[model samples]
Target: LATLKVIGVGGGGNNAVNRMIDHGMNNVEFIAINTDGQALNLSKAESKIQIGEKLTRGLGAGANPEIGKKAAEESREQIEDAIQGADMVFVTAGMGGGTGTGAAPVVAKIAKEMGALTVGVVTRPFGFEGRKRQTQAAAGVESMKAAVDTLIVIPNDRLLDIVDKSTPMMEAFKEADNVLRQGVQGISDLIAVSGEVNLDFADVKTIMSNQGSALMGIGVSSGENRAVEAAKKAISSPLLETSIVGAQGVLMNITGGESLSLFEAQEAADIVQDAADEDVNMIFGTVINPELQDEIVVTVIATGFEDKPSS
Candidate 1:
């Protein structure tokens, strides 16, 4: 078994972590780090760190990345303790904000330095947030790319494409949080859950450790041809702008009820495999969950993109 730690940084990050718990995330350590003590107090994470206590006086980072960075520096010792023995560290945050933009990369850098396979799942601001935030998020993404082993970015504006135009404001935000939750949960399940064909920590390390930009997708179906339907949806995740055509490695998992056949699982895996180059490194695992009687779920993480997607 592997020790997986999901660390949510700043306000946006803390909310995302809180949402994950609401969605029943477990079997892993969850940490919420923030410059504002009040925000940290609201997190449902197992561990919490109030960073920059003296520097920010617990008021907040005031949307200044420098203060966020300085605060993280001041709390480095606590952060290190939180990630001390994590086999894998996932830094979750929403970029373009002061605390996330400044502290997320620093936290990731620390995780990487501590010999963990560091992965970042972050979101860029919506267009309505203004061009300034866009540029700020771009810089944050660059910093994140350099700091983590693998980086997965989700742009908040993409939610408009899949969601109804008149949906509630918080609903749209929840959609964005859902994407990040699935990405973190997918990888966590791959290594933590015991399946018929387990994808152990070693397999994940080989495909993700020190990798570049990565993509994640999840599909669920209950129809007659659930396997194929779910697989297609998984590869066609709307959260990402890049395709899997040029990916160098792929990690996928098929989850279904006992009625799922080996051939059925293979069929789904092959569908995802076909989207990429023929020579791409593909590894898959199957999970038989009795609770999912008639539904099948396919989750995929594709890494080693030749070029990072331009913001």
Candidate 2:
């Protein structure tokens, strides 16, 4: 398994990374960072770092970028300690908030400057959350883009596509969090263990470091027709709303079991190809695992969004 570290920058980011505790992602470490002492204390992460303790008396920045940055500036040692010697660091944050808006970029900067390939996972505020926050998230992306190798942005409004308004707020948020965590874990799986056709970190960097950053999502299914179902469902996932057929690059992977048919994996890759332009640089790999049984899982990391900072 590939060793990696995850840094959750604020309340939302912490909550999203916190969800990873339920799964078994190999060789992954978690560090939850926050200005709010109480929220940090509540994190299930074995490692937690609190910032801006004296500045705000551990009360948090309350959406002020200055205060957020100050906490980080004052707590540089803690930040450095958490990511010590990390080659790959995954930073997750909810943009527009105090620490997320300010400190997240700082964290990514620190990691990248230290020579790590940092991946930024961020969520933009909902439209209904007010223009003030929405505008701030737009700027936050700019702050983060310069400091990371690849950035994955998820919009809050589009999260509703996977759930209805009647659903409980926490539940809806869980659905969104699930989307982020699964996409991330899929990447972890993709890089940590080699697939049949092979999509190592080098191949990922080739696509992720392209002129345009990328979008990624994953889907899993079992039983009859699982491969094609998983392929279509992955494209339809709430995490992937951007144009699929138009993406400039696509990296697809499938993992299945002893009963997994060669044609099923081939069919899954073929179906995914049909969704992309004929000339798109589409590469796929498969891993046959006895543990998978009839299960099939598909993961995609695609590029071709506009060359904008918000991506």
Candidate 3:
């Protein structure tokens, strides 16, 4: 049987796993590594490991860089245990301030060194998470990007587009979780299936290892009748439409709080078809979080290409 080993390395990683379970993706075993034993204990991971001598306070800001380095140094053994006879390993974290940011790259490096296909799912901070945290997150992302075969980025700002101003913070968190799970699951399905059109774990690893960069595009609707606009806007970036000649791939995803209109769905399909003809080998997308306002968000990933070629 094909096995997927997932490691959640920080608060954001823990949150992502909780969301995965909430969305009913039970195909993989979960392992969470955190600086705080309490935080690790709170996660729904199948196994847990603690970093450093004691837990760090705050979110990302309190994460010690040295602990991150140490985690990377000791990660070889943990990876061996987690991926023992496994086909693929996935590492998730929110890099910018805490253990996840510092340790995720180390974990991915260890997995790759062990000859297992490795992928990293990371979240970035939104405005005011702190400049230091933001800088740290960027550095962490760069580190993971260089070490892992593929990196799936989730932006915190995108959450604001789906959540209502009136919603409570807890409810907003749930909404964020749903959005993220839908996106990741979409990619997971593509990578899990086998076929000329589908992307498997090996494909994911290949894209990550060879691609110059990987980025995600998120779209959303604000009104009941605006789903199409939301989708168009989400994929409107010049970067999304850019195509590659060879060794490149683009994955598009849509998640919403309401039902999408036929026109909206077709528009999305059309964009993806055009992209595919231009050499995108695979596409993954889905909808979730139906709201009264018919909001939608789309994420586009461009891989294996240098810069957006001149039109």
Candidate 4:
């Protein structure tokens, strides 16, 4: 069996990884790493590592990426041990803060050097977090972008586009978690579960490895024209400011109930194709989930997208 290791770096990263555990993802090892001993204590993972204990004395990175990088450097051996022998490594984090911003790229670089297909799933801070935080996040993105195979950055401010302004702060946070969960879960399922098209490790490596920026969208629906609606919704994600118009690689996973039709699957893929370059490289996996009933779920990731112009 192939191994997929998901590593959560820092506080927000740990919470997102913890949420994945609650979602009951299978066939993957979950590990949490943090500079703060207390934060690491609360993480619900099979293994946890406290880095830079000497440097920070079990304290936090204090929103300084340099310290975070140093802490990760101090414990490089431990981090390497944690992700050893993984075929794919996912480095999840919330950028702008210290650990996530600095340490994540270090971890990604290590995983990549170890011959793992490393992917970074990170979130940019909300607008209200201040210009300093935003600047820090942009710098973090530059570091992270170079280290990972495909970097998926979800802007936290995009939450406003999907939910009402009156939504609770905690509830708004959950939206980002949900997106992170789906992105990791969707890719994992494509590898772990045998589907009609059978997307294996090689296929994933072909589509994802070494790709630059990535855009992710997940849509679920049931009823007439559900497949089309799902495809449209996935491509029209508010967070997808970067267009996939010339994306060189697209990976999609389609899941449905027993009644799912070949034509419906084909239709969904076609919709995504129309939205991208005519010669785009696209691969899809179709799955049948009995519990889905009449509902259809579609997950789309478009990679090799050029970075959006800084605002």
Candidate 5:
């Protein structure tokens, strides 16, 4: 089995990870960390850690990033223990609050120290959530970028482009959670899932460990010309706005049925090549599952962005 796990920090992050438990994911461990014992109790993570046993005493950081950081520091040994022996450690948090903004970087720093490929996934506060949270989040992102290999920042405001406006607020948040869940799933899938022309974990390690920014986009299509269509959607995803003109490396993963042909695979690669720089180092992988018959999902991870994208 792949030594991989996903850790959610803070209240928002904990909720998202717990919800992913019922989403068809297997062989992955979910751990939740929080300053508030009440919120930790609500988490369904395989392991839960509460920080600042003496300071906050389980009430929470009270939206103070400093307190959250202190909590993480106090429980550093336990935090490190949770991520030890993992091949890849994903840190998910909702920036703006105490644990998410303050302690998320602390978690990333420790995960990196454990020698795992650490990736930070952060969700920014909604536009209406006030500038105080936004300011806290910005500082958190900067802190995290220094700690993790690559930080994928998602702005909650961008959901306006995809989800319906009148959707219930909680459902809207759920959509954001899906965004984080899918990205991590795609990378983990690329690493250990059965695939023809396996890209190998070493390839991803090289891409992520190298000097560059990274963005991953996933698209789904079915029926005729699904490969090309899915590639197009992946390239044009609003979720991934990074320009690939200077990408040093690209990895494209295709998941489809046994009927998936070599011709379709080539088509997918061709589409990816055309969208990326002429000299970009590119690789491909495929997973054939009976359930995906007549259906294709394209997942593309690109690194070395000259200009980091923004919402």
Candidate 6:
């Protein structure tokens, strides 16, 4: 079995993990680190790591820089210890808060330094959440980008589009949780299952962390065929076919449209395989928005992992 170590710093990480649990994900070990004990009670993981210090809040402003530094220092030590001997380390947090926003990058840096393949998943603040939160989230993302091998950003604004406009705050939270769960499941499946070709987390990490650039693209299309085409085009344009010689991981998303036939979806997968040239090792994809129109949007995230350096 592949071992995945997930570190949730501050409220965002904890909330994300809780959302995952609510959606029935039980494949990895979850560790929550927060100055507030609320996170400890909230996380449904088999294990929990609580770091007590009012280092930072999600408010973005009035961030205790001194506390932020201390939180980062502690987070580094804890994350290193948690990820020891793990196959993959996924660090998550809401970037606008004090502890998660300030310390998550430090922990991610430590994970990378320890030679683990690292992926950082960050959720940014929505509108009216305050400009300070937005700034903090942006800074957090930039910091993680420099340190982690791969980063998956989930913006609050992006999530709001999928949910009911009239849904209550708590209900909206649940809905968003479900959507993110599906997304994470898709990626995790790609990591765990063998695609047309077999690529492991280590291979993915190598390409993402050491080899080349990595960028993410996500789209929602009306038809499976169109969706696949969008994904292929999105990836091919930037990474180029020549560079994608080995197994590639692709995450496909279908949202707000007609029901996609299984055959069509598989056909799209086949198309992606052909475009990739190499067999796909892992694929993450899902369909949402039953009432969506016939449009396809693809988010292609490519990482260069060739042993030879890029010019």
Best-to-worst ranking by lDDT: 1, 4, 5, 2, 3, 6
Q: What is the C-alpha lDDT of each candidate?
A: 0.85, 0.78, 0.61, 0.85, 0.81, 0.59
Best by lDDT: 1
Write the residue-wise lDDT of candidate 4 on 184-233 in tens digits: 66777777778876777787788778878777778888999999999988
Better of 5 and 6 by TM-score: 5
Tens digit of lDDT per residue, candidate 5, span 178-254?
65577677877776676876776787787776343567778899999999999887766454334455565788888
- TM-score of candidate 5 against the unseen true structure: 0.90
Please give, for residues 1-311, the per-residue lDDT of candidate 1 as tens digits: 67888899988899888887887876778999999898987889989999998988887788788888888988889999999998889899989998999999999999999999999989999999999999988999999999999988888888888777689877877877776677767877777689898887787888888888887789999978899999898888577755676777888888899898888888887887778754567888889999888999998888878644323
Worst 10 residues of 5 by lDDT: 237-246
Clashes of 4: 0
Candidate 2 deviant stretches above 4 angstroms = 191-194, 210-212, 222-224, 239-245, 259-262, 304-311
Candidate 4 collision pairs: none
Give per-model TM-scores. 0.91, 0.88, 0.68, 0.91, 0.90, 0.66
lDDT of 6 at 54: 45
Please state the error at residue 282 of candidate 2 in Å. 2.8
RMSD of each: 3.0, 3.3, 7.0, 3.1, 3.1, 8.2
* Cα lDDT tens digits for candidate 6, 109-157: 7877877677776777886798977887788777777877776566777
Error of 3 at 282 (Å): 5.9
True lDDT of residue 224, candidate 1: 83
Residues 1-311 of candidate 2 have per-residue lDDT tens digits of 44578889988899887777765555778889999999998898878999998888988789987788888888888888888887678889999989999899899888888766688888889888899998888888888888787777778887777676588877777776765577667878887776767887766666666233456777789888898998887766454435465665678888887777888887887777677654557777777777766778888877755532222
> In model 2, where is the ten-residue run with the lowest total lDDT?
302-311
| Candidate 2, pairs of clashing residues | none
